[PDB]
Design a protein around this ligand. Structure first.
Ligand code: BOW
Ligand code: CL
Ligand code: ZN
Length: 257
C-alpha cells in the first residue's frame, strides 16, 4: 500500500509512514500576498540554464521527471535568498483533473491549473543524496501554469509523454532547454519549507515566481492522459497529483518585489 494521491493513500494518510508530514515547515502553503513582506536583504535571483543538459524523462507513478546531468557545474540557481550555488537535477509538474485546480502552492487561496517544480541541490553538499540531509540542502523554483495561450517551449515535453504513459517507463530526453518554461518576470515569494511528496523532507528553500506561464488546454490535457498505474494494470489517470496547502506555523513569506 504505497503512498499516492487517492482516497486511501493520499496526503491525509502520508503522516503515518512519514510523521514529518505534520512537521514545523511543511510545503506547500498558501501565499497570502498581503501578509508577505518585501525583503531588501534579498539579492537579485540568478537563473543560469544556458548549459543545462537533460538526459531523459520518466513516469515514476506520481508525476513525470525530466532529469538532468548534474555531474558538472551547469544549470545553476543562485542569488535571492540562496547562499551559494544550487544545481538543477530535475523538474516535474503537479496538475489537476480540471483547470480550476492542480497547483500545490496557492496565491490568496487561488489554485492554478498546474505547478512546475525545478529542483536544485546545494553544491556545498557534494550531491543530491547528502543535500537532503541538510536544512538548506535544496532549492525548488516553483512556477504556476494557467490555461490560455500555448507555451511553445513545453511542446517537446508534451509530445514525448505518449512514450511514458505508465509507471516505470522512461525515454531519452536530451537537449531540452528549461529556459523555455520561464515567465518574463523573476519576481518571487520565498520561504523555508519541504518536499511536497514523501519523504516530505524539510530541506527546501522555496522560490515561487509571481508570474505564471500560460499553457494551452491541449497541452495540459495531454498531461492528464498519463497513468498512475503500471503497464497492464487498470487505468487510473494521472491527475490531481498535488498536495494541498499546509499550516504556515512559525514562518514568514518574503517578497522579492
Ligand atoms: C529524497 C527523495 C526524493 C525527493 C523527490 C523530490 C521531488 C519532489 O519534491 S517537490 N514536489 O519538488 O517538493
Ligand atoms: Cl482514484
Ligand atoms: Zn513537486
Amino acid at each position: 500500500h504505497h503512498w499516492g494521491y487517492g482516497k486511501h493513500n493520499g496526503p491525509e494518510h502520508w503522516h503515518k509512514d512519514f510523521p514529518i508530514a505534520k512537521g514545523e515547515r511543511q510545503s506547500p502553503v498558501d501565499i497570502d500576498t498581503h501578509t508577505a513582506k518585501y525583503d531588501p536583504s534579498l539579492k537579485p535571483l540568478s537563473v543560469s540554464y544556458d548549459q543545462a543538459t537533460s538526459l531523459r524523462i520518466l513516469n515514476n507513478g506520481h508525476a513525470f521527471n525530466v532529469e538532468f546531468d548534474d555531474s558538472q557545474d551547469k544549470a545553476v540557481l543562485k542569488g535571492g535568498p540562496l547562499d551559494g550555488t544550487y544545481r538543477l537535477i530535475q523538474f516535474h509538474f503537479h496538475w489537476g483533473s480540471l483547470d480550476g485546480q492542480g497547483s500545490e502552492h496557492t496565491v490568496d487561496k487561488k489554485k492554478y491549473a498546474a505547478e512546475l517544480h525545478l529542483v536544485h541541490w546545494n553544491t556545498k553538499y557534494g550531491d543530491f543524496g547528502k543535500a537532503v540531509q541538510q536544512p538548506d540542502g535544496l532549492a525548488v523554483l516553483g512556477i504556476f501554469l494557467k490555461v490560455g495561450s500555448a507555451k511553445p517551449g513545453l511542446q517537446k515535453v508534451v509530445d514525448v509523454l505518449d512514450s511514458i504513459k505508465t509507471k516505470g517507463k522512461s525515454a531519452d530526453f536530451t537537449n531540452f532547454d528549461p529556459r523555455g518554461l520561464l515567465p518574463e518576470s523573476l519576481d518571487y515569494w520565498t520561504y523555508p519549507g519541504s518536499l511536497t511528496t514523501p519523504p516530505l523532507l524539510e530541506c527546501v528553500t522555496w522560490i515561487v515566481l509571481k508570474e505564471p506561464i500560460s499553457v494551452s488546454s491541449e497541452q495540459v490535457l495531454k498531461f492528464r492522459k498519463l497513468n498512475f498505474n503500471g503497464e497492464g494494470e487498470p487505468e487510473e489517470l494521472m491527475v490531481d497529483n498535488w498536495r494541498p496547502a499546509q499550516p504556515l506555523k512559525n514562518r514568514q513569506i518574503k517578497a522579492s518585489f
